[PDB]
């Protein structure tokens, strides 16, 4: 069919309704709305020539990972024996050709007048560049600017199980590590629902969801299998993404190439576990929530996510976890 343009996946009024939500090295995400429906859309230059935002430019080779594991991970949605809801919904991925629209610029200068940006203007592309267009599920706001905004530290426990549970759930199903699951690529939404269900390995169970749903977004690094295929992004000669500082986050990614020995092909599902440590450490350290501890059933729910913290690095998997936890039970 060949590559579409910006016009197929944005016509006229789900263009004028974008407004930036994030960036990454990566490029750009948008929201808008259709059939009264919001959606996020991340947009992704490859095959060029030009360095965008001090990077060069995915092949379509190197992006096909991150749109296969996409659609698994949305697909878990509705499969039986290894159900979870707890990664976001993908609606489509279109391959377009164009240069970037300018309703789009007008909503990137917005951005960078009121947040500020890291990321270069993407108005030099020519007519003949190359996009990824992924359309998700709008998923809600990332933990990292919910860092004020939460009720309670009782919050974070139904936070934490419902990450634990959603890879749990793709441990099982698909041998999937997320690889980078930093606090801007957790989203939490209101739900009216009280209890969030999963099924794992055939065995269905609930959680109380605090009024939030959680979901993981964000593929770029992760991997997965089915039937011995392993599909990854092989980071083994990369030398930057080690040699980061003043995060947690970057010493998880020196612990994941501790733990894999630097062969990304592998199966390590310990990596999900640390970066489960890495949230619940956020949770601890970062998050400041509108009601501290002040009751006996409170306090004391400080005290097993604390524990948690404390014990969780000696359990190998999320699945080991959700299934062995105390936390959980
Ligand atoms: N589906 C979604 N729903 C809501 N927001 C989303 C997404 C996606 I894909 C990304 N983002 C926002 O974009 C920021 C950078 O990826 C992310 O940190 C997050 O702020
Ligand atoms: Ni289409």
């Known amino acids: 069919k060949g590559p579409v343009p910006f016009s197929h996946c944005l016509p006229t009024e789900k263009l004028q309704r974008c407004e930036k939500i994030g960036e990454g090295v990566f490029g750009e995400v948008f929201q808008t709305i259709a059939d009264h429906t919001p959606v996020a859309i991340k947009i992704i230059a490859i095959e060029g020539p030009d360095l965008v935002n001090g990077s060069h430019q995915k092949t379509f080779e190197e992006i096909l990972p991150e749109i296969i594991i996409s659609k ?11 159900r979870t809801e707890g990664f976001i919904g993908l609606n489509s991925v279109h391959c377009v050709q164009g240069s970037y629209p300018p309703l ?8 960078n007048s009121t947040k500020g940006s890291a990321n270069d203007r993407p108005d030099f592309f020519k ?13 809600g706001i990332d933990l990292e600017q919910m860092r004020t905004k939460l009720s309670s530290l009782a919050t974070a426990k139904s936070i934490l199980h419902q990450l634990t549970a959603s890879l749990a759930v793709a441990e ?26 999963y099924t794992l390995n055939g065995k269905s169970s609930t959680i109380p969801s605090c009024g939030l749903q ?7 690094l992760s991997r997965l299998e089915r039937d011995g295929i392993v599909v990854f992004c092989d980071v083994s000669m990369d030398e930057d993404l ?22 990304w092909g ?5 990596s999900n576990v640390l970066w489960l440590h890495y949230l619940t450490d ?21 005290r097993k996510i604390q524990e948690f913290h404390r014990t969780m690095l000696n359990f190998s998997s999320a699945t080991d976890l959700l299934c062995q936890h105390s936390l959980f039970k």
């Open 242 to 263: 080690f040699t980061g500082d003043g995060d947690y986050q970057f010493d998880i990614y020196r612990l994941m190439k501790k733990e894999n020995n630097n062969r």
């Open 172 to 197: 099982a199903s698909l041998r999937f590590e997320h690889r980078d699951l930093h606090w801007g690529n957790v989203l939490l939404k209101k739900t009216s629902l009280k209890k969030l269900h």
């Open 214 to 220: 959680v979901s993981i977004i964000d593929y770029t």
């Open 127 to 139: 007519d003949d560049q190359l996009f990824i267009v992924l359309e998700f599920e709008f998923g």
């Open 282 to 302: 956020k949770m601890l350290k970062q998050m400041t929530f509108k009601t501290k501890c002040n009751t006996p059933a409170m306090k004391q729910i400080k």
């Open 72 to 82: 698994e991970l949305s697909l878990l949605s509705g499969e039986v024996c290894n």
């Open 266 to 270: 592998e199966y390590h599902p310990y």
């Open 104 to 111: 789009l610029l007008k909503a990137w200068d917005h951005y």
